[PDB]
């Protein structure tokens, strides 16, 4: 499913660009923050990367709605395509999970 425990950020880009479409996304372990996770999302033919905060009390994207589990966070943003914006602003839609 959408969770890939064994890939890097670069590997995530290669997958999405070769096996995904615009709107495809996956979750993977974080390099900058070992033990954490990161969303890798494809849009406009390019791959973008969103940090997932795990406080031990909840999951979020260092802001926005808080979630008890990683899966529910992902579920929420798949169901609310307008909630994840950069400050540009531009929307980043989690549409299609790229399965493992």
């Amino acid at each position: 499913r959408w969770f890939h425990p064994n890939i890097t950020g670069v590997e995530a880009e290669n997958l999405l660009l070769t096996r995904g479409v615009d709107g495809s996304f996956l979750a993977r372990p974080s390099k900058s923050n070992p033990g954490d996770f990161t969303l890798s999302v494809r849009r406009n033919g390019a791959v973008t990367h969103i940090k997932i905060q795990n406080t031990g009390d909840y999951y979020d994207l260092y802001g926005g709605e808080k979630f008890a589990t990683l899966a529910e966070l992902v579920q929420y943003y798949m169901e609310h395509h307008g909630q994840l914006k950069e400050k540009n602003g531009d929307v980043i839609e989690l549409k299609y999970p790229l399965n493992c």
Partner: peptide, 11 residues
């Protein structure tokens, strides 16, 4: 090698 991360506006 190290990849791009977005600045988000969420709150």
């Amino acid at each position: 090698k190290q990849v791009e991360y977005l600045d988000l506006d969420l709150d």
